[PDB]
């Protein structure tokens, strides 16, 4: 039962609607009033993995499967054959994609290797409508390019995951698709995608509404913004935290 997002005619109310349902599926509960992912050491493994298609047409269609204890995508799968990232945990392949041919991918998910291999930071790499049909075109072709794959992934990973995790992100992907414009992620996107752990840590170890260890996020205008407490508007923008601890 994958949630189905479709390029075909996407609008503003079908992202929506598709992360909406995600978020939905990912959340394991609400701490200071925001939902938090399930806590991977009380979690049952036949509920941790779940599958995403995403759709050019009713005949060119991947899947991708994601890691409930941190959003993460772990593998994806086009047809007979599935890809799962070099640090994917050992039991994905034991849930997803399991009646097709896995392979395992030469490189991590993380940024720091995706970058590597596809030779562009995600500031350079383009995100939107015509960027996710042009990755789902590529991964159910087959092509080896491994630099293309890494790139397609740096994609899917913000407009699925980190669009999951952030509503700045998902608002701007939203945009994005509203009025046609693709987007390079802003410093502010960037800061959000590589402090989720810190801010999700903040808020559930906070004493009296406060952090105990501050972060320094990047603004809409390229200004660093310090955060330090639960009251700070920014902390708005998470969607889900990855579990921490219980406050
Ligand atoms: N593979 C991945 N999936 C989701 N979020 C990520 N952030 C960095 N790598 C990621």
Same mark, same amino acid.
């Given at each position: 039962?994958?949630?189905?997002?479709? #390029?075909?005619?996407?609008?503003?109310?079908?992202?929506?609607?598709?992360?909406?349902?995600?978020?939905?599926?990912?959340?394991? $509960?609400?701490?200071?009033?925001?939902?938090?992912?399930?806590?991977?050491?009380?979690?049952?493994?036949? %509920?941790?993995?779940? #599958?995403?298609?995403? !759709?050019?047409?009713?005949?060119?269609?991947?899947?991708?499967?994601?890691?409930?204890? %941190? &959003?993460?995508?772990?593998? /994806? *799968? @086009?047809?007979?054959?599935?890809?799962?990232?070099? +640090? &994917?945990?050992?039991?994905?392949?034991? /849930?997803? =994609? #399991?009646?097709?041919?896995?392979?395992?991918?030469?490189? /991590?998910?993380?940024? $720091? +290797?995706?970058?590597?291999?596809?030779?562009?930071?995600?500031?350079?790499?383009?995100?939107?409508?015509?960027?996710?049909?042009? $990755?789902?075109?590529?991964?159910?072709?087959?092509?080896?390019?491994?630099?293309?794959?890494?790139?397609?992934?740096?994609?899917?990973?913000?407009?699925? @995951?980190?669009?999951?995790? =952030? *509503?700045?992100? !998902?608002? *701007?992907?939203?945009? !994005?698709?509203?009025?046609?414009? @693709?987007?390079?992620? +802003?410093?502010?996107?960037?800061?959000?995608?590589? %402090?989720?752990?810190?801010?999700?840590?903040?808020?559930?170890?906070?004493?009296?509404? #406060?952090?105990?260890?501050?972060?320094?996020?990047?603004?809409? *205008?390229?200004?660093?913004?310090?955060? +330090?407490?639960?009251?700070?508007?920014?902390?708005?923008?998470?969607?889900?935290?990855? =579990?921490?601890?219980?406050?």
């Amino acid at each position: 039962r994958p949630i189905k997002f479709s #390029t075909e005619g996407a609008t503003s109310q079908s992202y929506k609607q598709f992360i909406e349902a995600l978020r939905e599926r990912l959340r394991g $509960g609400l701490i200071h009033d925001i939902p938090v992912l399930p806590d991977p050491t009380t979690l049952q493994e036949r %509920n941790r993995y779940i #599958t995403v298609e995403l !759709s050019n047409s009713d005949t060119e269609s991947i899947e991708v499967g994601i890691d409930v204890t %941190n &959003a993460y995508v772990v593998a /994806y *799968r @086009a047809g007979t054959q599935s890809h799962f990232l070099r +640090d &994917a945990p050992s039991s994905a392949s034991d /849930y997803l =994609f #399991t009646g097709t041919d896995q392979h395992s991918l030469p490189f /991590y998910g993380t940024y $720091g +290797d995706l970058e590597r291999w596809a030779h562009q930071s995600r500031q350079q790499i383009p995100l939107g409508l015509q960027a996710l049909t042009h $990755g789902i075109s590529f991964f159910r072709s087959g092509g080896n390019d491994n630099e293309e794959k890494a790139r397609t992934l740096i994609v899917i990973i913000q407009m699925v @995951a980190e669009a999951a995790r =952030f *509503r700045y992100i !998902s608002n *701007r992907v939203r945009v !994005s698709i509203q009025t046609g414009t @693709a987007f390079q992620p +802003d410093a502010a996107m960037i800061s959000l995608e590589n %402090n989720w752990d810190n801010l999700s840590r903040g808020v559930q170890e906070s004493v009296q509404d #406060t952090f105990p260890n501050q972060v320094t996020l990047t603004n809409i *205008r390229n200004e660093p913004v310090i955060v +330090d407490s639960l009251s700070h508007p920014t902390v708005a923008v998470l969607a889900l935290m990855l =579990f921490v601890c219980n406050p």
